[PDB]
Design an enzyme around this catalytic site. Structure first.
Site, PDB file in Angstrom:
ATOM      1  N   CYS A   2      -2.220   5.838  -3.378  1.00  0.00           N
ATOM      2  CA  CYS A   2      -1.664   4.570  -3.845  1.00  0.00           C
ATOM      3  C   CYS A   2      -1.867   4.389  -5.343  1.00  0.00           C
ATOM      4  O   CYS A   2      -2.924   4.704  -5.886  1.00  0.00           O
ATOM      5  CB  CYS A   2      -2.317   3.415  -3.089  1.00  0.00           C
ATOM      6  SG  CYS A   2      -2.421   3.738  -1.351  1.00  0.00           S
ATOM      7  N   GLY A  22      -5.359   7.462  -0.408  1.00  0.00           N
ATOM      8  CA  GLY A  22      -5.840   7.274  -1.756  1.00  0.00           C
ATOM      9  C   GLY A  22      -4.845   7.597  -2.853  1.00  0.00           C
ATOM     10  O   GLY A  22      -5.194   7.488  -4.035  1.00  0.00           O
ATOM     11  N   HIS A  66      -2.868  -4.439  -2.932  1.00  0.00           N
ATOM     12  CA  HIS A  66      -3.630  -4.285  -1.699  1.00  0.00           C
ATOM     13  C   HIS A  66      -4.993  -3.648  -1.926  1.00  0.00           C
ATOM     14  O   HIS A  66      -5.762  -3.538  -0.969  1.00  0.00           O
ATOM     15  CB  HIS A  66      -2.825  -3.528  -0.632  1.00  0.00           C
ATOM     16  CG  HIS A  66      -2.499  -2.092  -0.955  1.00  0.00           C
ATOM     17  ND1 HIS A  66      -3.463  -1.117  -1.113  1.00  0.00           N
ATOM     18  CD2 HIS A  66      -1.304  -1.461  -1.070  1.00  0.00           C
ATOM     19  CE1 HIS A  66      -2.875   0.048  -1.335  1.00  0.00           C
ATOM     20  NE2 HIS A  66      -1.564  -0.132  -1.303  1.00  0.00           N
TER      21      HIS A  66
HETATM   22  C1  LIG Z   1      -3.926  -2.537   3.020  1.00  0.00           C
HETATM   23  C2  LIG Z   1      -2.623  -1.843   3.476  1.00  0.00           C
HETATM   24  C3  LIG Z   1      -1.442  -2.379   2.699  1.00  0.00           C
HETATM   25  C4  LIG Z   1      -2.457  -1.979   4.983  1.00  0.00           C
HETATM   26  C5  LIG Z   1      -2.750  -0.349   3.192  1.00  0.00           C
HETATM   27  C6  LIG Z   1      -3.826   0.417   3.974  1.00  0.00           C
HETATM   28  C7  LIG Z   1      -4.007   1.908   3.709  1.00  0.00           C
HETATM   29  C8  LIG Z   1      -3.114   2.585   2.692  1.00  0.00           C
HETATM   30  N1  LIG Z   1      -3.334   4.029   2.522  1.00  0.00           N
HETATM   31  C9  LIG Z   1      -4.330   4.548   1.583  1.00  0.00           C
HETATM   32  O1  LIG Z   1      -4.472   5.718   1.553  1.00  0.00           O
HETATM   33  C10 LIG Z   1      -5.168   3.642   0.666  1.00  0.00           C
HETATM   34  C11 LIG Z   1      -6.092   4.118  -0.221  1.00  0.00           C
HETATM   35  N2  LIG Z   1      -6.646   3.092  -0.820  1.00  0.00           N
HETATM   36  C12 LIG Z   1      -6.106   1.969  -0.321  1.00  0.00           C
HETATM   37  N3  LIG Z   1      -5.191   2.323   0.604  1.00  0.00           N
HETATM   38  C13 LIG Z   1      -2.629   4.927   3.421  1.00  0.00           C
HETATM   39  C14 LIG Z   1      -1.716   4.125   4.318  1.00  0.00           C
HETATM   40  O2  LIG Z   1      -0.641   3.732   3.970  1.00  0.00           O
HETATM   41  N4  LIG Z   1      -2.306   3.911   5.640  1.00  0.00           N
HETATM   42  C15 LIG Z   1      -1.759   3.176   6.787  1.00  0.00           C
HETATM   43  C16 LIG Z   1      -1.633   1.691   6.464  1.00  0.00           C
HETATM   44  C17 LIG Z   1      -0.921   0.957   7.599  1.00  0.00           C
HETATM   45  C18 LIG Z   1      -0.777   1.806   8.867  1.00  0.00           C
HETATM   46  C19 LIG Z   1      -0.028   3.113   8.584  1.00  0.00           C
HETATM   47  C20 LIG Z   1      -0.461   3.785   7.283  1.00  0.00           C
HETATM   48  C21 LIG Z   1      -1.789   6.033   2.820  1.00  0.00           C
HETATM   49  C22 LIG Z   1      -1.804   7.340   3.548  1.00  0.00           C
HETATM   50  C23 LIG Z   1      -0.983   8.478   3.045  1.00  0.00           C
HETATM   51  C24 LIG Z   1      -0.150   8.217   1.799  1.00  0.00           C
HETATM   52  N5  LIG Z   1      -0.158   6.908   1.092  1.00  0.00           N
HETATM   53  C25 LIG Z   1      -0.964   5.772   1.575  1.00  0.00           C
HETATM   54  C26 LIG Z   1      -2.036   1.820   1.908  1.00  0.00           C
HETATM   55  C27 LIG Z   1      -1.848   0.327   2.171  1.00  0.00           C
END
Ligand SMILES: CC(C)(C)c1ccc(N(C(=O)c2c[nH]cn2)[C@@H](C(=O)NC2CCCCC2)c2cccnc2)cc1
Ligand SMILES: CC(C)(C)c1ccc(N(C(=O)c2c[nH]cn2)[C@@H](C(=O)NC2CCCCC2)c2cccnc2)cc1
Lengths: 303, 303
Positions: B144, B142, B40
Site C-alpha cells: 500500500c 504492505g 487506512h
Molecule cells: C484496512 C483495509 C482498508 C481493510 C486494508 C487491510 C489490509 C490491506 N493490505 C496490506 O497489505 C496492508 C499493509 N499495511 C496496511 N494494509 C492487503 C489487503 O488488501 N488485505 C485484505 C483487506 C481486505 C480483505 C481482502 C484483502 C494487501 C495484500 C496484497 C496487496 N495489496 C494490499 C489494505 C487495506
C-alpha cells in the site's frame, strides 16, 4: 498478477551518457572517470564487414569521441580497448556513480535491462541469458551500450552491455570487461546462434510460482527420479536438471510442500500431453525466464 | 522480443518513504514537504470492518505518524485527510522532488508501478487500468502506498496510489487526490468488481505491434465497418471501438500500411475462429494491456 518485474533503475540511470564517434551515436556507461561503450562505435560503413579495431583505434584521437552527460560535454582524456569495449577516460568523475561490480553471468540467469537511446533511458524490463548466450531483448537501432544489471541492496552488479542484433532478431553483447557472451563477434557477418534450449530449472520455478498463486491443476500424484525426468526432458529440448538445480529449488519446495522431484513429475506429464487449452498463470506456454530467485523475491517482496 | 516495458523509475524512487502508524507500516510519497499515503494506515484490526476515518483521524496526533526516508526520521508537522489519502506535513521538503503533476487516468490507459515495501523500492513493471477500474497488479501485503506513474520527458505524472487487494486477487487504489478508481471503499467488506471487458483499442495496437515485428499470419483480405465490427465485439466481451479509437490508431496504421478497419476485420476473424494453436508475438491469447502509445514508443524508442 505474476509478471516480469525489473529492478528499480535509478542507480543506473545516473550512469548513462551519449557517445558519438563520427556519424555514429550510441550509449556509454559513466562510472568514476571512465565511460565504457561498445568498441564498434569507431567503425564506419566502409569497415563494418571486417574491421581491424587495433588499426581503427590507432587512427582515433581523444577529440574524435564526443561524450555528453545530459547536456554536459565531458572531455575524453584518453582511450583504450579492453576486448570488445572501449574505455574512454574523461576528466570528471561521475558524481552519481553507485556502488558497483562487474560480473559475468551464467546461461539461465536473469537481469534488468535499462534500454537507452542517445544516452537517455527509455524503459526498463527483465531479460534472461539464453542457454545459447543470446538474449531475447527489446532493442532498437542505437540501443548499443545499454546495460543489464542486478541490484544487491545498495550494489549494482553490471552483467551485460548490449552490442548488436543478430539477423534472427535476438541480441548479443558482452560482459563489462568486453568479452562476448557466446560465439559472437562485433562485425557485420553471418552469425549463427546455436540451438536454443529451455531452461528447465526456471520452468520449475515458474510452476512453483503458479502453485503459490493457487494455479494448481497440473499437479499429479507421482514422483520421478532426476535421471528418469532428464530422459524425457532431452526429447523436448530442455536443459538437463542437475542436483544443484534441485537444491536451488529447495526454498520454493519448502514453501509449497511439493518436493522438487514431484514437481518434476508434473512437468514430465505437461511435456508429454500439453496443456489441453488450459493455461498456467495466464499463459498457454511454459515460461522459462523466471529464476527461482526471481520467484522467491516477487512472492516474498525482497527490497 | 516485444514485451511489457516500464518507465525508468529513478525520479519516483527518490520520493518513497516509510509510514508507520501504530503497528501498521506502509509506503508514502514524499513531494516537497508533504507525504501522501493511504488513509487506512490509521485503522486497527478492531476498526477495519467499518472505520470512521474522521473520528480515527481526530484521535491521532502528529507524533503517532512515524515517517522515515531511508534511515532518516522526518517530523510530521501536521496531518489532514483528502478523500482517501492522508497528507502528512513534514518539516523538510524532499530535495529529490521531481517535476510532477497529479492526473486521473482513463480505463484502458497504462502506467508504470514502482512496487515498494517498508518504504524501499523493490521492482518496476507496467500495468493497465482495467475497464472495471481494477488493476491486475503484482502487490504483496504492505505494498500500500506504492504509486503508478507515467513520465513525460522530465515530468512525472502520478496517476495511481495502491490501497488494497480485492479477495479475487485484483487491486484497487486511488488517484493522488484520494478518489478511488471504481466503486471501491477502504474498509474490510465484501466488494464486487464489475464484469471486466477486453480493451479493444489495445488489442488492435498489439496486433499492429505483431505486424511491425513480422508476425503477420492473422491478416486477411477483408475490411469491415465500425458498426459491423462492434456487433461481433460485444459478443466476446470486448469494449466498443469508437471513432476516437480509430483516430488514435492512425499512426500505427500509417506505419504498417494497414487501415484500421482492415485490422478490425482481422480481429473479427480471430475472435470467431481462435488461433488454432498458433501464436501472435509469442502469445496464445490476445493481449490488451499495450496502448497505441505503448506500441509506438517501444517500436520507435521514445526517451
Ligand atoms: C484496512 C483495509 C482498508 C481493510 C486494508 C487491510 C489490509 C490491506 N493490505 C496490506 O497489505 C496492508 C499493509 N499495511 C496496511 N494494509 C492487503 C489487503 O488488501 N488485505 C485484505 C483487506 C481486505 C480483505 C481482502 C484483502 C494487501 C495484500 C496484497 C496487496 N495489496 C494490499 C489494505 C487495506
Ligand atoms: C558495426 C557492427 C558491429 C556491424 C554493428 C552495426 C549496427 C548495430 N546496430 C545499431 O543499432 C548501432 C547503433 N549505433 C551503432 N550501431 C543494430 C545492429 O545490430 N544492426 C545489424 C548489424 C549487422 C547485421 C544485422 C544487425 C542494432 C539493431 C537493433 C538492436 N541493437 C543493435 C550494432 C553493431
Amino acid at each position: 498478477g505474476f509478471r516480469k518485474m525489473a529492478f528499480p533503475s535509478g542507480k543506473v540511470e545516473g550512469c548513462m551518457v551519449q557517445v558519438t564517434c563520427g556519424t555514429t551515436t550510441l550509449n556509454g556507461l559513466w562510472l568514476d572517470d571512465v565511460v565504457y561503450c561498445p568498441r564498434h562505435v569507431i567503425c564506419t560503413s566502409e569497415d563494418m564487414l571486417n574491421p581491424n579495431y587495433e588499426d581503427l583505434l590507432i587512427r582515433k584521437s581523444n577529440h574524435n569521441f564526443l561524450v555528453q552527460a545530459g547536456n554536459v560535454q565531458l572531455r575524453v582524456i584518453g582511450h583504450s580497448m579492453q576486448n570488445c569495449v572501449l574505455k574512454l577516460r574523461v576528466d570528471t568523475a561521475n558524481p552519481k556513480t553507485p556502488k558497483y561490480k562487474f560480473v559475468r553471468i551464467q546461461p539461465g540467469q536473469t537481469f534488468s535491462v535499462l534500454a537507452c537511446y542517445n544516452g537517455s533511458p527509455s524503459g526498463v524490463y527483465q531479460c534472461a541469458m539464453r542457454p545459447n548466450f543470446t538474449i531475447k531483448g527489446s532493442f532498437l537501432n542505437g540501443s548499443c551500450g545499454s546495460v543489464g544489471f542486478n541490484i544487491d541492496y545498495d550494489c549494482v552488479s553490471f552483467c551485460y552491455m548490449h552490442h548488436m542484433e543478430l539477423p534472427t532478431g535476438v541480441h548479443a553483447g558482452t560482459d563489462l570487461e568486453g568479452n562476448f557472451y557466446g560465439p559472437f563477434v562485433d562485425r557485420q557477418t553471418a552469425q549463427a546462434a546455436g540451438t536454443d534450449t529451455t531452461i528447465t530449472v526456471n520452468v520449475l520455478a515458474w510452476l512453483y510460482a503458479a502453485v503459490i498463486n493457487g494455479d494448481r491443476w497440473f499437479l499429479n500424484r507421482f514422483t520421478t527420479t532426476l535421471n528418469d525426468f532428464n530422459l524425457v526432458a532431452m526429447k523436448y529440448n530442455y536443459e538437463p536438471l542437475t542436483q544443484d538445480h534441485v537444491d536451488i529449488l529447495g526454498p520454493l519446495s519448502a514453501q509449497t510442500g511439493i518436493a522438487v522431484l514431484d514437481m518434476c513429475a508434473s512437468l514430465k506429464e505437461l511435456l508429454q500431453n500439453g496443456m489441453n487449452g488450459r493455461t498456467i498463470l495466464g499463459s498457454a506456454l511454459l515460461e522459462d525466464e523466471f529464476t527461482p530467485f526471481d520467484v522467491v523475491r516477487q512472492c516474498s517482496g525482497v527490497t
